[PDB]
């Protein structure tokens, strides 16, 4: 259900997307 | 594959407003221009840029700019150098309550920051001077025998090409015997020869027509080549800083000849691709620019194969830049950083059947 706004990948756990966001960030 | 399609950015929605008039400022003149905050790319003159305006303040600013010169500025980040962008394509649908504005612009000129100011509203203004574009005369225009001046005009260009180029070099740089350098040294600072060499290099990435695909002006040709080279932000800004066309052409040729490896930016050691695999699928060149559903801009480069990547997600045709293709998210095998997507066709009889589109940002050129 979860999906990253930037890369578009689909995730399932909130922590997964939280850590994913850091990859393409400042 | 009819490489014409990706240029049109048909995924925007078509039915786009068109403008015919263009405006050019004066060289060395100082002008005040607004700066859009969302944009972050290092725009180059002649390159097309799509954008999706969401926030109400920037939407209103764009609406106002429509009737105005339709121009703004993009800063190549601290900001010292930037590029003016003229907006030519505009559309608004307003669906979903929010005002989703879709725009397409093109770079016009290069400027240097003189002063930057911030207003209460939130948008930023900047006064800047327009850097000039300098073109040098023929290197043999200084030393010359006037009697031989009648031999400068050559017959129209048609194995055969090699012989014609040898004759051209032997005849144009004759008076080089009056200086302390040979002809082949002067040939390295020639616009036509460098352009021909760059055409030969590009021929391996496409089956395009030489006459129509590229312009005949050294400045336009140099900017077009620069707009389609997988180089870092530092390299691109260094290219932009260059003033003369000959220097830019030489730098582009050096980059093409030397830089052969493309590695993960984050890792800096995980090799990803080799230049030999670089192939173009859009007339714009091997690397193009697109916009995601949420408006973020991405520079994408097409390659037949990749390596050291992990695939997540499932194929989906939603909002795909490439018509008739799906995508799955590709992360670095080491750092898991996004590198791009894998595109696989859903219909057969496609050249190719699958490939990879890697974002420019994650790339890092490496010289073996």
């Amino acid at each position: 259900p979860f999906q990253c706004n930037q890369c578009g990948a689909s995730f399932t756990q909130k922590g997964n997307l939280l850590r994913h966001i850091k990859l393409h960030s400042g | 594959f009819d490489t014409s399609l990706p240029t049109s950015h048909t995924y925007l929605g078509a039915d786009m407003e068109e403008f015919h008039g263009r405006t050019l400022h004066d060289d060395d003149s100082c002008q005040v221009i607004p700066v859009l905050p969302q944009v972050m790319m290092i725009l180059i003159p002649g390159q097309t840029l799509p954008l999706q305006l969401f926030h109400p303040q920037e939407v209103s600013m764009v609406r106002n700019l429509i009737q105005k010169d339709r121009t703004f500025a993009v800063l190549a980040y601290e900001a010292q150098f930037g590029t003016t962008a003229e907006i030519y394509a505009y559309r608004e649908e307003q669906d979903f309550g929010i005002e989703i504005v879709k725009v397409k612009a093109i770079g016009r000129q290069r400027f240097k920051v003189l002063e930057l100011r911030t207003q209460s509203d939130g948008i930023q203004q900047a006064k800047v001077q327009i850097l000039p574009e300098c073109v040098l005369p023929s290197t043999m225009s200084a030393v010359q025998l006037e009697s031989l001046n009648k031999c400068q005009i050559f017959p129209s260009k048609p194995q055969c090409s090699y012989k014609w180029w040898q004759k051209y070099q032997k005849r144009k740089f004759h008076c080089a015997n009056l200086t302390s350098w040979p002809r082949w040294l002067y040939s390295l600072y020639d616009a036509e020869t460098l352009m021909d060499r760059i055409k030969k290099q590009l021929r391996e990435w496409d089956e395009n027509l030489k006459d129509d695909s590229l312009p005949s002006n050294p400045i336009d040709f140099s900017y077009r080549v620069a707009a389609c080279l997988p180089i870092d932000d530092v390299l691109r800004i260094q290219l932009l800083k260059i003033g003369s066309a000959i220097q830019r052409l030489r730098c582009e040729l050096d980059i093409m000849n030397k830089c052969t490896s493309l590695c993960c930016k984050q890792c800096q050691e995980t090799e990803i691709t080799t230049k030999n695999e670089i192939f173009s699928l859009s007339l714009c060149g091997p690397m193009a620019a697109y916009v995601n559903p949420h408006g973020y801009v991405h520079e994408t480069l097409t390659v037949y194969k990749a390596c050291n990547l992990n695939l997540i997600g499932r194929p989906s045709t939603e909002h795909s830049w490439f018509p008739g293709y799906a995508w799955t998210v590709a992360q670095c095998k080491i750092c898991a950083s996004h590198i791009g997507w894998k595109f696989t066709a859903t219909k057969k009889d496609m050249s190719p059947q699958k490939f990879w589109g890697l974002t420019r940002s994650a790339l890092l050129p490496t010289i073996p």
């Binding site: - | 300098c134 040098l136 001046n149 009648k150 005009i153 009056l178 082949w184 000959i246």
Partner: protein, 806 residues
């Protein structure tokens, strides 16, 4: 903070213009020769040229023509400058005083435009009614010619054909008519126009366009009674007169291309031609009387008169005496006999004129005086190359022919010999190998050798190293390199603790398939016992553009790398350090521990050597897109260079700058318009060895001019600048051309006033003016420990002291 002083030690000698006519007197025949900035007027007699007048102009003469408008006893002169200064002059003689008075003057530059590829063209209508100039593509400038046009007002006319190759007015036409050969995608064509002054327009000409040969390059206007035009290309010569059309394709002229011509008979029965290889041909037109009195052309013929110097412009004087001016060799006077000699040549040489240009390299040596220097230069090209020895007596000049193209030279004192890099052309052999064209100095040496190998009819370059005795200048030895090898640099020096002396040569391997060479050699030879032996050899992946000796080590430039080599006791080159640049290091100079690196687009770089770290360290840089031809170091702070538009510039570094950025950038503190393409710089002097001037730099240029540059103190610079300003208001310049405009820094896009340079010629001209003018000049002036009203005597003494340097 430069305060430099530049003077000319040898006036230019290369000839780029020659015209004949009754100029100084209607009863006299005059020959005018234009050599860059100099105009020489001779009177031709039975014995030969008798010099009469010689003047210098504030410009490079680009167009020169003699015309005689109705109502004039004798012809006038029309001159144009590369800066678009146009002037109409008359020769007036009053008693024993001779002067040139400017009938008219003006500037014919356009604010916006692009100079044509083929260059400036000027023409005068035969009836003497207008002047037609071609300067920018797509436009044709017309100056009406009237007695009350002293301002030279001109008007432009639109021209549809962008690429005009040639254009000339036609004789015997009712209204001003011009025939021109142009090019377009279809091919090359010849077309005619009639110029209307009343409406300032073009009108359809007599005969319509005719498709011409795909290489037509020369147009000659045949005078009455034949009229029409003659078009000369590589493989044929044609004559067009409208309905008439007569062409020939002789098999003699296909060897080379004709690049000059000159009418001989007043009625146009015959004409001369010369090609790039020196051949001199005579073209004959056969006259037909028709059957009703009217005459018409009947046939054309070509005959090879013979061989001479590489002609730049021919001219026929009288009684078979032909003056052949050359930009590469020596101008000659030759005689055309009616009977050929044993060989077959019809031309017999009579005289010769010295011509040092083009000077591709030079050196300063002390042969016998031990206190006074002398100059050795490599002049000429092709079969005109030679060595010139120059010493103060006017300058005494000695010549040593080589019959091939020299490129570099150096002096080895120990062995009393000169080492010269040279090249010659060989025609490919259908059976394999190569064949020489003539006996050159590289093949007549007493002893010869060929380098050991390692790793059709088209010209091929063969490079050689020649060892020449310093006394008899005989070719002691010759050495030949491999095939497809190009020798670039030459150096003589010791290395390390080795007490011997060597010649060090850099070569690049070049093939007609790759842009960059990507392979080359460095070779160390030793000369002794009358024999040359290869002491050492090394291979480098690149081309060695330049080399220098650096505190007992060897500094080389390989593509974009600067490499320092040390000499080991085993007689081998061991790498010491490297430094990678972004620019091809063409020009290398050194002084103390500082190094100056330059490329072909004026990208100057300063480097220093750190013994503690044993590696280089960038100090300062200066990048500005423009063509550079040379660079030299004056002292630890100032640097001199020659750049596009025949300009000199001087850059400086501020040692005491507060911030790193300020001291990381070079300042431009000197600009000057020399008017010559400087080719080589050197340190030395030609006078016997506390003085106002410190240092001395000799520069040699393409036209054959030698110039001298020195430094000055601030007070002297101010005094000389004030004197220059005062003098500019009392000197009657020819054509009324402002000195400041002439010496202003010039390019295609920028133009700035001259600063930091004092023109030596103008200052030294102070002695020629009359005493009352001298008194007027120094009026209300201060001079030196308490400043006082300056007197003419003090300035005269100062000027003599200054002119004593050169």
């Amino acid at each position: 903070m430069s305060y430099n002083y530049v003077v000319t030690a040898q006036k230019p000698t290369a000839v780029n213009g020659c015209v004949t006519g009754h100029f100084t007197s209607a009863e006299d025949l005059n020959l005018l020769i234009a050599k860059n900035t100099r105009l020489e007027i001779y009177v031709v007699t039975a014995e030969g040229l008798r010099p009469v007048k010689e003047v210098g102009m504030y410009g490079k003469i680009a167009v020169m023509e003699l015309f005689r408008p109705k109502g004039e006893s004798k012809d006038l002169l029309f001159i144009l400058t590369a800066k678009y200064n146009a002037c109409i002059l008359e020769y007036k003689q009053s008693g024993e005083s001779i002067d040139i008075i400017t009938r008219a003057h003006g500037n014919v530059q356009d604010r916006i435009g692009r100079p044509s590829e083929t260059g400036i063209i000027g023409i005068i209508d035969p009836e003497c009614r207008m002047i037609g100039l071609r300067l920018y593509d797509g436009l044709f400038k017309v100056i009406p010619l009237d007695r009350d046009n002293k301002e030279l007002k001109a008007f432009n006319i639109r021209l549809e054909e962008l690429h005009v190759i040639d254009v000339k007015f036609l004789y015997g036409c009712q209204a001003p008519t011009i025939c021109f050969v142009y090019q377009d995608p279809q091919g090359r064509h010849v077309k005619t126009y009639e110029v209307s002054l009343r409406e300032k327009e073009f009108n359809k000409g007599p005969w319509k366009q005719e498709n011409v040969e795909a290489e037509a390059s020369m147009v000659i206007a045949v005078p009455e009674p034949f009229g029409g035009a003659i078009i000369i290309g590589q493989e044929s010569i044609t004559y067009h007169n409208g309905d008439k059309y007569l062409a020939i394709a002789p098999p003699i002229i296909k060897q080379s291309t004709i690049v000059c011509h000159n009418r001989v008979d007043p009625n146009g029965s015959r004409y001369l031609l010369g090609d790039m290889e020196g051949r001199l041909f005579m073209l004959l037109l056969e006259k037909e009387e028709q059957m009703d009195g009217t005459v018409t052309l009947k046939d054309l013929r070509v005959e090879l008169l013979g061989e001479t110097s590489i002609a730049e412009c021919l001219t026929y004087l009288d009684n078979g005496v032909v003056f052949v001016g050359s930009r590469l060799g020596d101008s000659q006077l030759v005689k055309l006999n009616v009977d050929s000699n044993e060989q077959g040549s019809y031309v017999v040489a009579m005289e010769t004129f010295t011509n040092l240009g083009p000077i591709v390299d030079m050196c300063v040596v002390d042969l016998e005086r031990q206190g006074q220097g002398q100059l050795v230069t490599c002049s000429g090209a092709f079969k005109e190359g030679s060595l010139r020895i120059i010493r103060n007596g006017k300058l005494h000049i000695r010549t040593v022919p080589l019959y091939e193209s020299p490129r570099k030279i150096c002096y080895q004192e120990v062995s009393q010999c000169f080492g010269v890099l040279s090249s010659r052309i060989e025609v490919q052999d259908t059976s394999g190998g190569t064949t020489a064209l003539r006996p050159s100095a590289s093949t007549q040496a007493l002893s010869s050798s060929v380098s050991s190998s390692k790793l059709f009819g088209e010209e091929v370059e063969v490079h050689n190293l020649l060892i020449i005795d310093q006394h008899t200048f005989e070719v002691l030895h010759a050495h030949q390199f491999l095939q497809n090898e190009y020798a670039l640099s030459l150096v003589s020096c010791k290395l390390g603790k080795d007490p011997n002396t060597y010649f060090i040569v850099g070569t690049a391997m070049v093939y007609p398939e790759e842009a960059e060479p990507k392979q080359g050699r460095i070779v160390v030879f030793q000369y002794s016992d009358g024999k040359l032996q290869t002491v050492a050899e090394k291979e480098v992946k690149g081309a060695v553009y330049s080399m220098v000796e650096f505190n007992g080590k060897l500094l080389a430039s390989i593509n974009s790398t600067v490499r320092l080599y040390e000499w080991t006791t085993e007689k081998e080159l061991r790498t010491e350090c490297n430094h990678y640049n972004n620019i091809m290091a063409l020009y290398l100079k050194t002084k103390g521990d500082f190094i100056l690196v330059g490329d072909l687009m004026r990208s100057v770089l300063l480097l220093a050597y750190k013994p503690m770290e044993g590696n280089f360290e960038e100090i300062a840089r200066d990048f500005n897109p423009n063509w550079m031809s040379a660079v030299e170091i004056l002292d630890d702070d100032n640097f001199l260079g020659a750049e596009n538009a025949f300009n000199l510039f001087v850059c400086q570094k501020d040692s005491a700058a507060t911030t790193d950025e300020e001291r990381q950038h070079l300042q431009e503190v000197g600009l000057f318009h020399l008017g010559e393409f400087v080719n080589v710089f050197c340190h030395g002097s030609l006078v016997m060895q506390s003085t106002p001037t410190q240092g001395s730099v000799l520069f040699g240029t393409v036209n054959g001019m030698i110039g001298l540059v020195t430094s000055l103190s601030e007070s002297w610079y101010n005094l000389l600048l004030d004197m220059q300003n005062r003098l500019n208001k009392v000197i009657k310049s020819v054509g009324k051309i402002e000195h400041s405009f002439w010496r202003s820094f010039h390019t295609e896009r920028k133009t700035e006033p001259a600063t930091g340079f004092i023109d030596g010629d103008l200052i030294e001209s102070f002695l020629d003016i009359s005493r009352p003018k001298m008194q007027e000049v120094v009026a209300n002036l201060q001079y030196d420990g308490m400043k006082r009203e300056a007197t003419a005597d003090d300035l005269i003494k100062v000027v003599e002291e200054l002119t004593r340097i050169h």
